[PDB]
Structure formats: C-alpha cells, structure tokens
Amino acid sequence: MKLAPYILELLTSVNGTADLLVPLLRELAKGRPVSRTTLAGILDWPAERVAAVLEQATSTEYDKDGNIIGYGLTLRETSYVFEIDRRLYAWCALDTLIFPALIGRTARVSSHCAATGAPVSLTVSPSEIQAVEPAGMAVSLVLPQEAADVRQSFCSHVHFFASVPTAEDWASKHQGLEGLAIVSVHEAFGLGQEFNRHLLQTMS
C-alpha cells in the first residue's frame, strides 16, 4: 500500500525529457501530428536535442510523414479513451489520471474493465476525479522496468477494473508481473499527483 516505489521508477524510465514532455502533450492535445521542427520551435531547442530525447523513447508513435502522433497521449486508438470535442487516446489507465494536470484541461475518460469488459468512465481534472462509474473502480500497477520498452513493460499492464475485488481476482492469475498491485482509482490519482509534483520540480 506504499506507492513511492512506483513513483520513483516511473520517473526513472520516463525521465531534458521532462522539459519536452509537457510541451509535447499539450501539442498532441490539439488533435494533430507534431513535427520535430515544430516541437523544437516550441522548446527553443536545436533539432538534434529533440531527436536525441525522442530516440530514448522507444514506444514513440509516428505517422506516415514521421511526425509524432503518440507519446503517452496518442491519436491512434487504444482501450483508453481520452476526450477533451476531440477524441484522443492514452497508452494506459494511469496516463489518463496524470495528463489532465499537465495539460491544464479536464478530460472525459472511458474504457472497459480488463477482467470483465464492463464499461467504466470518469471525469479527470487537474485536481480531482469525479463521476467515477462504477464508484469502486480500480487500477492495476506494475513496477516500471528501467531500460525496457515502457509501453510493453508498464503501460500494457496498467488497466481499469470495475471493482477492487474483481481486480484482485484478476491479479491472482497474473504472476510474472513485477510488483503487480491493485489500488482504488482514487489512490491511483493520488499517485499521479505525486508523480506530477516531482516531475515539475525536475523541469527547467
């Protein structure tokens, strides 16, 4: 029930990366592909720097023209719907809880329980979650692996569930996952707040 280990490792894997992160998310939030030169202009960075940082992010999604379309927040369909009239998507459940505070917008999030397929939805603002349906919604966490593909090693195991017991039944069948944990969606949101408050201090 102690979540510092997840906060610590998430920052490790994820993280001038932090300097690039927030501006990229806010761009992607406009609903369109982001070029390296647009990104570079926004940051006041030389192009080599932007490229170097992106090269460390192996899960980064690109379109036909090689522009950024996915980086946590994505234009390519996933199980995690992230609506701000735009319909965007997130790589994992925790992403949906973190992004709103970083982009300064409230988001309507929806998905399906990973154990049962039941619909789940909530509204996530920079400071709280609301309209949590179902109320007992849960989230799975694993410990990020430091040098691994973040989307495969972390994001693909970080789901919403209709309930904490339902989530725990599911977790009981999923060994092999490092540091697998079930928390309430409210606890997951608190984790995301901690993550952000730290991340922001790392920024220049």
Q: Residue 45 or 154: which CB sits closer to Hg ion?
A: 154
Give the range of 25-33, 44-52, 147-155, 183-191 binding Hg ion by CB under 5 A.
147-155
Angle between helices 185-202 and 17-28 (to 10 degrees): 120
Pull the structure tokens for residue 49. 């720097």
Cα separation, 67 vs 65, whole angstroms: 6
Q: Which of 6, 80, 82, 91 binds Hg ion (CB under 5 A)?
A: 91
Our finding on whether 95 is near Hg ion (CB under 5 A) is yes
Q: CA dist 152 to 15, 125, 147, 148, Å?
A: 17, 27, 12, 8
Give the range of 60-68, 76-84, 85-93, 162-170 binding Hg ion by CB under 5 A.
85-93
Number of residues that bind Hg ion (CB under 5 A): 4
- Residue 177 DSSP class: S
Which helix (DSSP H) or strand (DSSP E) does residue 136 occupy?
none
Nearest distance from residue 158's CB to Hg ion, in Å? 6
Nearest distance from residue 138's CB to Hg ion, in Å? 16
State how far Cα 74 lies from the chain centre.
10
Cα separation, 120 vs 163, whole angstroms: 10
Q: Report cis status (omega within 30 of 0) of the bond before 134.
A: yes
Our finding on whether 195 is near Hg ion (CB under 5 A) is no
Q: Residue 92 or 137: which CB sits closer to Hg ion?
A: 92
User: Which residue in the block uniquely carries the two structure tokens 């973040």?
Assistant: 150
The catalytic residues are 92, 95, 155
Nearest distance from residue 62's CB to Hg ion, in Å? 18
Q: Which of 28, 92, 115, 183 binds Hg ion (CB under 5 A)?
A: 92
Our finding on whether 155 is near Hg ion (CB under 5 A) is yes
Give the range of 56-64, 130-138, 149-157, 163-171 binding Hg ion by CB under 5 A.
149-157
Q: What is the contact surface with Hg ion in residues (CB under 5 A)?
A: 91-92, 95, 155
